[PDB]
Structure formats: structure tokens, C-alpha cells
Amino acid sequence: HHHHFNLPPGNYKKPKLLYCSNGGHFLRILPDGTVDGTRDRSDQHIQLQLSAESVGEVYIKSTETGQYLAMDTDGLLYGSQTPNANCLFLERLEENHYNTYISKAHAEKNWFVGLKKNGSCKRGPRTHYGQKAILFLPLPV
């Protein structure tokens, strides 16, 4: 409706790491609810289980802590104990290869999940199509 519908080839059977090519960081949801990225592959908070809602919609959950990736009304990512409406993302194929995630609650504003080269999360309004920050590649755990 507000966005294209090219979907990635993967499935949600197994947990995945979401690797961001921008800076080479794995998306991480820390125990205290902070979200960032780390290059440390042995990190216990980068293992994520994705699950579907409607076709093309996913929840992103830390297998270690059970927290769901969520976006607040100012566009900031955080870890939520429960899977509310702001935990749903529109997962799409991008540049015919990568995966991108747009906040469903804020989809009309094009607020993406994105990581800066320094490993910190980008605020929703500062993301947009064409950035490397929004490009992820799911990898086996």
C-alpha cells in the first residue's frame, strides 16, 4: 500500500543474525532494553528469532532475553518485553539482495531499522531508502 512488495527468499524456521553491511555490525538487543550493533560474533544478544504476522510482516525477538525489537513514537529502537503493535516490521527485499525493515506503526513516514557505521542505531526520521544503514543480511547462528 505505502511500499513495494518484493519479499526476501528466506524463512523463519531458524534463528538468525541480522548483519548490517553499513558498518559490519550484528543487530543487538541488550538486557537493559538498549539496541545497537556489535561486531562481536560471540555476543549472546545478537541471536534473533523472526516470526510472521501477515505476509511480509515480522516480529524480531532476542532468543536470549525474549525481548522484541520495537520502535517508539520518536523513531528510536528499543527492546520490548511484549510483542505490541510497535514491534511489527515490514520485511522487504532491497537492492535485489538485502533485507530492510520498516516500522509498521510508522510506515507512512518510512521509518526503518538502521545501524550507523559506528554501531549505533539510527533514529527513524534519519533513515531513508538508499542508505547503507538500512541494509541487512540474515545469517545462520
Domain CATH for 26: 2.80.10.50
Q: Would the annotation count 86 as a binding residue?
A: no
State phi, psi for 69 to the nearest 5 degrees. Answer: -70, 135
Cell numbers at residue 58, please?
Answer: 515480522
What distance in Å separates the CA atoms of residue 138 and residue 98, rounded to the nearest whole number?
8
Q: How does DSSP classify residue 123?
A: P
Q: List the resolution, Å.
A: 1.9
How many domains in the chain? Answer: 1
Place of cell 538508499: 130
The distance of Cα 48 from the centroid of its chain, to the nearest Å, equals 10
Technique used by the depositors: X-ray
Domain that holds residue 66: 1-141
Closest to 49 in 3D by CA, of 64, 70, 30: 64
What distance in Å separates the CA atoms of residue 53 and residue 90, rounded to the nearest whole number?
10
